[PDB]
Write a protein that binds this DNA or RNA. Structure first.
Lengths: 94, 147, 155, 127, 255, 120
RNA sequence: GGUUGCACCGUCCGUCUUGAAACACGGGGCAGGGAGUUCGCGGCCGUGGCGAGGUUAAGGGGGUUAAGCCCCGUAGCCGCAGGGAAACCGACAUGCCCGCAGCCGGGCUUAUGCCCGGUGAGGGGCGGGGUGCGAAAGCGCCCGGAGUCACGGCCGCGAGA
RNA sequence: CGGCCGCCGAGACCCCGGCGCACGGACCGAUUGGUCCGUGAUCGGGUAGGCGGGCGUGCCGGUGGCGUAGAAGCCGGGCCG
């Protein structure tokens, strides 16, 4: 598979980069967060536990999928404006 | 949420529209007479009914009480009182005599019945008691006082 | 023992629910699908009923080898060739056939091959007709080794 | 590159086409409508419901298209209706093509076409 | 979790503890049942005339003439009554005044729905979906000092928003979202604005007398707050601007 | 879903968390906890705290796919994890039991499915 | 795409009906209009809150331009014990045994998975119990705490339905 | 009429590719739903009827768009389903 970062917003008040993915999967599964997670760590050169991936949808079988992630400077700050539900779903803890 | 027409459809164009033959949808006859009609009928009508035990028989036999003659009572199990004891704080607690707690049932005015066990000694005052209720209260180390 | 190949020529239509179901119990549903059955009196019996609906007869080893090869497969696009049989169990396809013929093993034991083979029409068509029995010269019922012909045309 | 499997199905769709599945006999009465409109022959009587030959085909699911191919335009691409310049954003020029809505004026349309070609997105109209 | 309280110079001072309600699980399904319930309650009845079809007598035109036995009127052959096929005939199932108009929702249930809509504001993801565009990101929701409530003049409450960076949201609310499609506009409910921030105060009556002016801005107190204001059309995550006494009194959640 | 299937988002998300656990650690139990949630509403647990007391000795991890419902003794050192509790229930369990804890924090207690007993 | 020639096949539609191309019934053509609806009550279902209780209705305080929502009222209904016509009496927060899920143990396949022993909530089967009939016995009904309220819809009945 | 041989001749049956359903596995979502893979020889006619998914119409609310550099509507054509 291959992922590109399509559109970029930056909020420096809370010190993150926020990113939109346009995912190309060609006859292969709708991606888990984890498979996006290892590949993303290589592009950013930032730790895996700081990089938090949420919300994904899945189109009609055409081979584009959308999703969002956020890449954080500090690891206190993936828990200030981001609730329980994402984090547990990533598998950061445990 | 289900659109009835969505099911009826313009769809099914059954046009019968979940009724069957066209002849069927009509008057009282499909129903077998109006309402409860036909229960009584000796003749075929409804006999059997859309009741599970079918229809129970007709002749309500037996007699009426005057409303006045019915004292109401209000029954409570010892189980209810016993579980609630800590919640019952408003009602006195006397460790020395009276059992563990002194409860006048009369806060809920009632006849006390025997079901359940009694975890503590209770001194219970009530309008009435069953003999089973007496045995369990005494076994707990409590006492029963009749008002 | 003797092994027979059974093929249903006649469709589900005009069958008794007892015979039609018997055919399903033969592991034969449809037209032109063929099955391997052992000769036991209990086993024999299903075919006896079926007789009017079906063609049966004992096959040659050679003809059996051509049918296992093309037609056979539990699942998957993959054909049952020497190599595939070999991974199953036994040395090769030849041994595997000799063992089936002896009745030493079965297809199931060896798993990943089916008890039903979806066989071909006979080219030159049904061997006599669906109307009548083997004696009468028609396709139905117990046949000789001449079953070889019906199945070869079937592949 | 784009795929082979997608071509395979696109060719099937061309080749295969579709009958018409405009509602039962339509020529006969002008009442029986206007050039769209299937409704299934609900009648018992029907030869088309009886499915006698020559009485056109009635719809069955069997007739469909491959999912991957359904909804694809005739140059292979994927439609996105585009009302404006903002709608153009996040449109993959390689996969998708834009249709400017009929409603849209020349005044917006000049801005839309010129920006859509810089994004590399094939448009349609003008001017 | 603490949230900075801000002076009216648009700068932080202190940080104070956040109430329970803001942690509560996100539950659009609860809010939806609640929002639906409030809307149906503020519907005014609808009918159709009940004596119609008694003003049109209706008589039967017989047989023996190769038409139906369906009733017309005496002298003209026209529209009648006791028909649904005809022009002028009854409609079939006219609207009644006995039509449903209430949906209960439990006092326990409603408060939980309220909690659920306020909690949604703390979240970034709901807040951007709702359409509020915020330049003051770590300040979800924003609490400001008690002096803000006493302000009741439009010019004064305006200035303060620009300095806080939350005037930008009203700019959004200016964009028109109720010149509606459809003929029904004529009867009313056209040429109107859109929603924007919700302002909660503790004091200075039940509304602020200068903040009802501002576009899309709806004012309330904590003793009147309802799901409709907090998350209309079942879309929570609508930005709030809080008053220190309001946060304290909400702390005491009751019902 | 089509007939039976939570409309509550919090409940549906918990089932999805449960599936991942089943796969990654390879135990059966969490998936069992998913099927019990999956049942209709009048088929999910209604658990009494004198029913807790009566079954399974101290220090075991009770997983309840419904509600714990107080009034009744509970003298066991059992630790209850559950989808909801009464106000009344929470007190009995936290005074005698190992603790009252939420079921979405059950991950933190026991993610692997040793020493657990399902109860309803 | 229009039209037409050619090949092949095709005796409307809807309805009645066992059988309709019909010498069964209905229709000139077109446009518009046109039919599963509301309340109460019961039986179901899904979903949601709360919890051995649960919900308010009627109402007036309050808020608002008005009003909904908010908080307040808890009358009453149902549930929490049943049986009996009534008099009137009043029960298992567990004694025994299986065993689904799961947990625990051994063996086994590369793995999933499998075979076998405990432990077994939920569930299943006894015992002992309440009460009614009863000299008695024997059954009838009931018994080791889950419901209430809310929302949509299916279905019954009364209503023009 | 009693034999026989070669052929012709279905939507059956075989065979490539595709589609839906059912079931398993995985993933995705804030609900419904969707996607990816695997298995199906023993899944795919259909009236009464039962169920399940989508479409469209009118208006309301939120949200987010369009219009005199041309809306709706009308008529013919193009494309998708």
């Amino acid at each position: 598979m291959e992922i590109r970062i399509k559109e970029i917003k930056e909020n420096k008040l809370i010190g993150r980069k926020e990113i939109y993915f346009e995912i190309y999967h060609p006859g292969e599964p709708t991606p888990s967060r984890k498979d996006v997670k290892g590949k993303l760590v290589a592009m950013l050169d930032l730790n895996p536990e700081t990089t938090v991936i949420q919300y994904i949808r899945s189109y009609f079988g055409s081979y584009i999928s959308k999703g969002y992630a956020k890449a954080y400077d500090s690891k206190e700050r993936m828990l200030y404006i981001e609730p329980e539900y994402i984090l547990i779903r990533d598998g950061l803890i445990e | 949420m289900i659109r009835r027409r969505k099911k009826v459809r313009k769809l099914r164009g059954s046009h019968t529209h979940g009724w069957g033959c066209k002849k069927k949808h009509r008057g009282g006859g499909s129903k077998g007479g109006r309402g409860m009609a036909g229960t009584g009928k000796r003749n075929k009508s409804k006999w059997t009914w859309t009741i599970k035990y079918a229809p129970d028989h007709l002749g309500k036999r037996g007699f009426s009480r005057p409303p006045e003659v019915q004292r109401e009572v209000r029954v409570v199990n010892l189980k209810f009182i016993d579980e609630h004891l800590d919640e019952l704080m408003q009602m006195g607690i006397a460790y020395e005599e009276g059992g563990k707690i002194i409860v006048d049932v009369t806060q809920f005015a009632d006849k006390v019945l025997g079901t359940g066990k009694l975890t503590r000694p209770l001194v219970i005052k009530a309008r009435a008691f069953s003999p089973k209720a007496e045995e369990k209260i005494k076994a707990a180390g409590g006492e029963a006082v009749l008002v | 023992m003797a092994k027979l190949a059974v093929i249903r020529i006649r469709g589900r239509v005009n069958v008794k629910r007892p015979v039609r179901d018997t055919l399903a119990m033969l592991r034969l549903h449809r037209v032109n699908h063929c099955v391997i059955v052992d000769d036991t009196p209990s086993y024999l019996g299903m075919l006896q009923k079926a007789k009017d609906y079906i063609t049966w007869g004992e096959i040659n080893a050679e003809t059996l080898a051509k049918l296992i090869r093309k037609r056979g497969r539990l699942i998957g696009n993959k054909p049952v060739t020497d190599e595939y049989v070999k991974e199953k169990l036994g040395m090769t396809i030849e041994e595997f056939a000799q063992k089936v013929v002896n009745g030493e093993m079965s297809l199931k034991d060896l798993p990943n091959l089916k008890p039903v083979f979806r066989l071909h029409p006979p080219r030159g068509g049904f061997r006599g007709s669906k109307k009548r029995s083997f004696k009468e010269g028609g396709a139905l019922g117990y046949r000789g080794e001449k079953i070889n012909e019906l199945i070869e045309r079937m592949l | 590159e784009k795929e082979f499997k997608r071509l395979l199905r696109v060719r099937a769709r061309l080749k295969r086409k579709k009958p018409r599945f405009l509602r039962q006999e339509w020529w006969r009465y002008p009442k029986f409508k206007n050039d769209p409109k299937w409704r299934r022959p609900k009648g018992i009587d029907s030869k088309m419901r009886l499915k006698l030959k020559g009485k056109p085909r009635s719809p069955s699911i069997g007739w469909s298209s491959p999912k991957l191919v359904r909804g694809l335009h005739p140059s292979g691409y994927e439609e996105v209706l585009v009302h404006n310049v903002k709608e153009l954003e996040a449109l993959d020029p390689k996969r998708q093509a834009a249709r400017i809505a009929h409603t849209v004026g020349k005044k917006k349309r000049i801005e839309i076409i010129k920006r859509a070609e810089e994004l590399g997105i094939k448009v349609l109209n003008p001017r | 979790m603490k949230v900075k309280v801000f002076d009216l110079n648009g700068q932080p001072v202190g940080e104070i503890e956040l109430p329970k309600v803001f942690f509560t699980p996100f539950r659009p399904d609860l809010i939806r049942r609640a929002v639906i319930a409030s809307w149906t309650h503020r519907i005014q009845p609808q009918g159709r005339d009940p004596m119609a079809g008694k003003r049109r007598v209706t008589e039967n035109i017989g047989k023996g003439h190769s038409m139906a036995r369906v009733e017309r009127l005496k002298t003209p052959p026209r529209y009648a009554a006791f028909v649904p096929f005809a022009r002028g005939g009854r409609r079939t199932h006219p609207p009644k005044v006995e039509k449903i108009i209430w949906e209960d929702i439990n006092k326990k249930e409603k408060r939980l729905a309220l909690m659920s809509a306020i909690a949604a504001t703390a979240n970034y993801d709901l807040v951007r979906a709702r359409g509020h565009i915020i330049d003051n990101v770590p300040q979800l929701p924003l609490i400001v000092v008690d002096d803000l409530q006493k302000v009741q003049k439009t010019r004064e409450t305006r200035e303060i928003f620009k300095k806080l960076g939350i005037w930008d949201d009203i700019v959004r609310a200016k964009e028109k979202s109720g010149v509606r499609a459809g003929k029904g506009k004529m009867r009313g409910r056209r040429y109107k604005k859109a929603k924007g921030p919700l302002i909660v105060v503790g004091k200075n009556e039940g509304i602020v007398l200068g903040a009802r002016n501002h576009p899309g801005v709806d004012v309330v107190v904590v003793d009147n707050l309802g799901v409709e204001h907090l998350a209309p059309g079942t879309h929570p995550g609508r930005l709030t601007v809080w008053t220190v006494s309001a946060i304290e009194r909400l702390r005491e959640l009751y019902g | 879903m089509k007939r039976t299937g939570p409309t509550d988002p919090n409940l549906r998300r918990l089932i999805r968390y449960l599936r991942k656990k089943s796969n990654e650690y390879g135990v059966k139990i969490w998936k069992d906890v998913a099927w019990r949630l999956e049942r209709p509403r009048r088929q999910r647990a209604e658990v009494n705290v004198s029913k807790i007391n009566r079954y399974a000795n101290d220090g075991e991890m009770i997983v309840v796919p419904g509600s714990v419902l107080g009034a009744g003794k509970l003298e066991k050192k059992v630790i209850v994890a559950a989808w909801k509790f009464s106000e009344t229930a929470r007190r009995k369990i936290i005074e005698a039991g190992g603790e009252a804890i939420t079921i979405e924090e059950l991950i933190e207690r026991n993610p692997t499915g040793s020493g657990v007993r399902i109860m309803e």
